[PDB]
Amino acid sequence: VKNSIIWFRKGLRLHDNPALLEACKDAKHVYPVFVLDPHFLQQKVSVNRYNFLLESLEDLQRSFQARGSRLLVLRGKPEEVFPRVFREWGVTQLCFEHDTEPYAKVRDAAVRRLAAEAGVEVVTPISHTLYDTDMLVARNGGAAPLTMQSFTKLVDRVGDPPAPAPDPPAAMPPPAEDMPSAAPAATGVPTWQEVGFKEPPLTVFKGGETEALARLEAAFQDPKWVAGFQKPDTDPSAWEKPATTVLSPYLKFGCLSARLFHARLLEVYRRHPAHSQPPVSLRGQLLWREFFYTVGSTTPNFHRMAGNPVCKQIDWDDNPEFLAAWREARTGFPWIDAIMTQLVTWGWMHHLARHSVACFLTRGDLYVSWERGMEVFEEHLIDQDHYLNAANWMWLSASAFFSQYFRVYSPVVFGKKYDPEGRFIRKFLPVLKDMPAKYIYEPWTAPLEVQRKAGCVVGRDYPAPIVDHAVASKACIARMAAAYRRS
Numbered sequence: 490v491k492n493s494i495i496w497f498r499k500g501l502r503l504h505d506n507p508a509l510l511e512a513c514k515d516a517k518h519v520y521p522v523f524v525l526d527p528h529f530l531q532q533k534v535s536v537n538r539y540n541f542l543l544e545s546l547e548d549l550q551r552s553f554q555a556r557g558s559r560l561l562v563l564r565g566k567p568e569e570v571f572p573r574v575f576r577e578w579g580v581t582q583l584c585f586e587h588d589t590e591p592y593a594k595v596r597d598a599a600v601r602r603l604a605a606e607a608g609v610e611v612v613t614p615i616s617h618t619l620y621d622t623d624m625l626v627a628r629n630g631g632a633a634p635l636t637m638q639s640f641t642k643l644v645d646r647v648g649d650p651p652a653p654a655p656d657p658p659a660a661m662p663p664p665a666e667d668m669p670s671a672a673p674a675a676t677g678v679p680t681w682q683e684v685g686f687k688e689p690p691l692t693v694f695k696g697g698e699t700e701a702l703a704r705l706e707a708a709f710q711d712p713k714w715v716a717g718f719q720k721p722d723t724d725p726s727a728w729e730k731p732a733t734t735v736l737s738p739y740l741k742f743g744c745l746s747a748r749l750f751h752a753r754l755l756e757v758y759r760r761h762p763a764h765s766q767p768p769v770s771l772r773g774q775l776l777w778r779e780f781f782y783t784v785g786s787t788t789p790n791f792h793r794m795a796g797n798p799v800c801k802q803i804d805w806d807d808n809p810e811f812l813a814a815w816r817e818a819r820t821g822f823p824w825i826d827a828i829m830t831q832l833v834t835w836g837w838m839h840h841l842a843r844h845s846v847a848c849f850l851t852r853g854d855l856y857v858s859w860e861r862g863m864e865v866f867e868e869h870l871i872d873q874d875h876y877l878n879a880a881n882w883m884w885l886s887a888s889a890f891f892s893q894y895f896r897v898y899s900p901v902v903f904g905k906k907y908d909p910e911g912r913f914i915r916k917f918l919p920v921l922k923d924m925p926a927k928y929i930y931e932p933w934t935a936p937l938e939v940q941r942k943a944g945c946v947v948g949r950d951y952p953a954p955i956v957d958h959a960v961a962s963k964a965c966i967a968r969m970a971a972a973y974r975r976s
C-alpha cells in the first residue's frame with residue numbers, strides 16, 4: 490500500500506501545497522507531521538513569533554480535523570524522529586516543500602539519505618517562492634542578478650510564475666489507528682506556557698492560514714488601492730490601519746502562498762491598465778522577496794560581513810552602550826523609541842519605520858554593526874526571514890545593494906512629515922501622551938514648565954537624547970566616505 494508523510498516546516502497551509510497533493514495521491518494513510526524541538530528555548534526568539542507559529546499549527550490542526558485527519562506535532566529532531574516513524578508507519582513517500590536556507594540545506598540532505606536507507610521516495614516541490622530560484626540563476630548565465638533592474642528583466646523574460654496548486658480533497662486519508670508515536674498526548678499542539686515562556690504575547694496579528702486568507706481578501710476589497718500601490722509613498726505612522734498589507738508574517742511561515750498573492754495581483758492588473766509597475770508596486774514587493782532569496786541562496790556567508798563577497802567591509806564600532814540604548818528603546822528620540830517599542834510589542838513595523846531605526850543604529854548616528862541590529866530584529870520580528878532580514882540590513886547600512894551614504898534620515902523630522910501631532914508616539918510611548926505637539930519629537934527642547942505640566946521631565950521620566958544628530962551624522966558620513974574610498 491502507500492503510506493505517506495507530508496512534512497511541514499514552512500508552507501503551513503492547505504492551499505497551493507503541491508507537496509500535500511502528492512502526499513494524498515493514492516495514499517492509504519497520510520501523516521501530517523511538524524517536528525518540534527522542545528529544547529529550543531534552552532539553546533533568541535520572542536514569544537510573539539513563537540506563539541504566532543503555535544497559532545499557525547492550531548489552524549492546520551482544525552483544518553485537518555475538518556477533513557478526517559489530524560496534525561502530528563512530533564517532539565525531537567528530524568534526524569532522530571524520522572528513521573523511527575518511517576518503519577513504524579510503513580512510509581513509502583516523504584513530501585515537503587523545498588527550502589533554500591543554509592540550515593535547511595544541511596537538514597534536508599540528512600533526511601534525504603535517511604529516507605533512502607528506508608526505501609522512501611522523497612518529493613520536494615518548490616512553492617515557498619514564486620519561481621525556481623535555481624532556474625533563475627541558470628537562465629541568467631549561471632550567476633544571480635545583483636540589481637533589482639536586472640532581476641526584473643530576467644523574470645519578465647522567464648514569464649508568469651506557476652499557477653497556484655488546486656485545493657486538497659475534502660476528505661484525507663487519516664493516520665493509521667493505534668500507532669505509538671502518533672498518540673494524541675505526545676503529538677498535540679502546545680501552548681506558549683507549556684514550552685517555557687513566562688510573559689504572554691502582546692502582538693495583534695494572529696497566526697494561521699485562515700487569518701492569512703482573510704487579510705488577503707481585505708486587501709483586495711479596494712482594487713484601486715491595490716493597482717495604484719506605491720511602496721515609497723506609504724505612511725509609516727499609520728498604526729490603527731497600517732498603510733501596507735501586513736502579510737509578511739504569513740508569507741514567512743508559509744501561511745499564505747506567494748503564487749496565490751501573485752495571481753490575485755495579475756487579476757487586478759488586467760482590469761487596471763494604469764497600475765503601478767515594479768519596484769514600487771505590490772507585485773514589485775513580492776519581487777523584492779524573490780530577488781533577495783535568489784541572491785542570498787547563491788552567496789556564502791550572506792547573513793554575515795566577514796567572508797561575504799557581496800558585503801563591504803566596514804570597521805563598525807563595538808559600542809555596547811549605544812546598542813543597549815537602541816535595543817531598549819531609550820535613545821531619547823521619541824520617533825526612534827516608539828518604533829523600537831512597536832518592535833517588541835507587535836513584532837511588526839512599517840518598512841520606512843524599519844528604515845529609521847536601522848539607519849540610526851548604523852551609518853546614520855551610532856555606527857554600530859548591522860549584524861548586531863539584525864540580531865535584535867531576528868528575536869522580535871514575527872516576520873523574521875533569514876534572507877530578507879539580512880539583505881535589508883545590509884541595504885540600510887550601505888554595505889550592499891545600496892551605496893548612497895549621504896542620504897541620512899533625521900530621527901526628528903522624518904516622522905513629523907507624516908504625523909505632526911505624534912499620534913504614533915503617544916500610542917507606543919504613553920509617558921509622552923500629554924506633551925504638546927510642538928515638542929513631542931524633541932522633548933529636550935520643551936521648557937521645564939511644559940515638561941512638568943505634561944508630566945514628562947526629560948532625564949527623570951524620559952531619557953535625554955544619547956547623541957546630537959547634527960554631530961553624530963557628520964562623523965558617520967565622513968567615516969563611510971573613507972570606507973568607500975578604500976575599495
Ligand SMILES: Cc1cc2nc3c(=O)[nH]c(=O)nc-3n(C[C@H](O)[C@H](O)[C@H](O)COP(=O)(O)OP(=O)(O)OC[C@H]3O[C@@H](n4cnc5c(N)ncnc54)[C@H](O)[C@@H]3O)c2cc1C
Binds near residue numbers: 738781872874875881
Ligand atoms: C532592516 C530591515 C529588516 C527587514 N527584515 C525583514 C524580515 O525579517 N522579514 C520580512 O518579511 N521583511 C523584512 N524587511 C522588509 C520590509 O520591511 C517588510 O517586508 C515589510 O515591512 C512587510 O510589510 P507588509 O507585509 O505590509 O509588506 P507589503 O508592502 O505589503 O509587501 C508585501 C510583501 O512583499 C514582501 N516585501 C515587501 N517589502 C520587502 C522588502 N523590502 N524586501 C523583501 N521583501 C519585501 C514581503 O513578503 C511583504 O509581506 C526588512 C526591512 C528592513 C529595512
Ligand SMILES: [Cl-]
Binds near residue numbers: 899
Ligand atoms: Cl529625513
